[PDB]
Design an enzyme around this catalytic site. Structure first.
Site, PDB file in Angstrom:
ATOM      1  N   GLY A  14      39.061 -26.654  19.578  1.00 42.75           N
ATOM      2  CA  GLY A  14      38.779 -25.454  18.805  1.00 42.75           C
ATOM      3  C   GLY A  14      39.834 -24.375  18.974  1.00 42.75           C
ATOM      4  CB  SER A  15      41.862 -22.404  17.526  1.00 41.27           C
ATOM      5  OG  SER A  15      41.704 -22.520  16.114  1.00 41.27           O
ATOM      6  CG  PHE A  18      38.015 -19.458  21.915  1.00 37.25           C
ATOM      7  CD1 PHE A  18      38.513 -20.778  21.870  1.00 37.25           C
ATOM      8  CD2 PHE A  18      37.020 -19.095  20.989  1.00 37.25           C
ATOM      9  CE1 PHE A  18      38.062 -21.700  20.896  1.00 37.25           C
ATOM     10  CE2 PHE A  18      36.568 -20.006  20.012  1.00 37.25           C
ATOM     11  CZ  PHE A  18      37.085 -21.309  19.970  1.00 37.25           C
ATOM     12  N   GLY A  19      41.560 -18.668  21.684  1.00 38.59           N
ATOM     13  CA  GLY A  19      42.884 -19.307  21.743  1.00 38.59           C
ATOM     14  C   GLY A  19      42.946 -20.666  21.048  1.00 38.59           C
ATOM     15  CB  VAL A  21      40.450 -25.107  23.687  1.00 38.59           C
ATOM     16  CG1 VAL A  21      39.998 -25.753  24.985  1.00 38.59           C
ATOM     17  CG2 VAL A  21      40.305 -23.591  23.744  1.00 38.59           C
ATOM     18  CE  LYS A  36      40.548 -19.725  26.439  1.00 37.87           C
ATOM     19  NZ  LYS A  36      39.435 -18.864  27.071  1.00 37.87           N
ATOM     20  CG  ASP A  97      29.180 -25.095  20.687  1.00 35.50           C
ATOM     21  OD1 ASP A  97      30.296 -25.064  20.108  1.00 35.50           O
ATOM     22  OD2 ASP A  97      28.091 -24.796  20.138  1.00 35.50           O
ATOM     23  CG  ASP A 136      31.874 -13.269  24.343  1.00 35.64           C
ATOM     24  OD1 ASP A 136      30.911 -12.889  23.617  1.00 35.64           O
ATOM     25  OD2 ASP A 136      32.881 -13.887  23.920  1.00 35.64           O
TER      26      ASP A 136
END
Ligand SMILES: CCN1CCN(Cc2cc(NC(=O)c3cccc4cc(-c5ccc(/C=C6\SC(=O)NC6=O)o5)ccc34)cc(C(F)(F)F)c2)CC1
Ligand SMILES: [Cl-]
Ligand code: NA
Lengths: 274, 9
Positions: A14-15, A18-19, A21, A36, A97, A136
């Protein structure tokens, strides 16, 4: 010593805020990892280690909590590059998740919400015992190890050292942010965390979060869109008390009647996850 | 009714 020979890099997981990963495997022993990457230009909060070399706060916070076994994701290693830091994290497999899990399954049975929420509480107590405030907490930042029935808190990129004085900065998720942040741009760590746990619990038992707009966040009205037991509604409502000092402590949450007779993680996997 | 992610950052 170098990042490329020591890990085999696989696909993007994912992105976003957060960045970037990636899935990976540590070549030493084929351990599943998540790699990450964070751009130095996009990091606003920096700390220093015991080592003395300067790192992003996220790294400082992960080392502080990666002490031992827990419901918090473990930082295995990290590297500095010219324009970024690369973080090697644990990767449970198979995993989902909590956001996708609730999308797919809808409102969770209370027994399952109870086991999950309890494990989130234990993880957040862990962070707080280690001097770390996550900032968060939300379904998106919780991984479920589908085989063990264990939850892991991820993404400390919006976190801070825990303090007892007021916070006037915040870069977590607004729909989990408390009303004192919305109106006054101030909060205290623990009480803000409990509000966000109230949002998460409603999310679990109702299938989505209660509030999308500021006016709903500050309005102090929780409408239940699913059948939810009175004891559970009471806990959610206590967590989402408008006045921070009116919210429960973690202890009071964990002693709440709705929280008793929690399933073990294995029981949870066996009943609800296989 | 529409359920969605919410970016932090
Ligand atoms: N399904 C999947 O396998 C999957 C989907 C989406 C995200 C996913 C994120 C991870 C993962 C594992 C560890 C981490 C740690 C992170 S990620 C981050 O931003 N900050 C952290 O500390 O993220 C694993 C699987 C998925
Ligand atoms: Cl905000
Ligand atoms: Na991989």
């Amino acid at each position: 010593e170098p990042l490329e020979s020591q890990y085999q890099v696989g696909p993007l997981l994912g992105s976003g805020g957060f960045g970037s990963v990636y899935s990976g495997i540590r070549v030493s022993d084929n351990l599943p990892v998540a790699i990450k990457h964070v751009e130095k230009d996009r990091i606003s909060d920096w700390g220093e280690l015991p080592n003395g070399t300067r790192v992003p706060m996220e790294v400082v916070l992960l080392k502080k909590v990666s002490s031992g076994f827990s419901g918090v994701i473990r930082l295995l290693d990290w590297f500095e590059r010219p324009d970024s830091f690369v973080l090697i994290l644990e990767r449970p497999e198979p995993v989902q998740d909590l956001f996708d899990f609730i999308t797919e399954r809808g409102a969770l049975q209370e027994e399952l919400a109870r086991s999950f929420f309890w494990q989130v509480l234990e993880a957040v107590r862990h962070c707080h015992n280690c001097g770390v405030l996550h900032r968060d907490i939300k379904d998106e930042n919780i991984l479920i190890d589908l085989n063990r029935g264990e939850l892991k808190l991820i993404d400390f990129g919006s976190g801070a050292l825990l303090k007892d004085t007021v916070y006037t900065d915040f870069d977590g998720t607004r729909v989990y942010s408390p009303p004192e942040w919305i109106r006054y741009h101030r909060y205290h760590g623990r009480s803000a965390a409990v509000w966000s746990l109230g949002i998460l619990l409603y999310d679990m038992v109702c299938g989505d979060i209660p509030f999308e707009h500021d006016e709903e966040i500050i309005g102090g009205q929780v409408f239940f869109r699913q059948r939810v037991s009175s004891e559970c509604q009471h806990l959610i409502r206590w967590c989402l008390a408008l006045r921070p000092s009116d919210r429960p402590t973690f202890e009071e949450i964990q002693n709440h009647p709705w929280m008793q007779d929690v399933l073990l993680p294995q029981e949870t996997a066996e009943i609800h996850l296989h | 009714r529409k359920r969605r992610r919410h970016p932090s950052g």
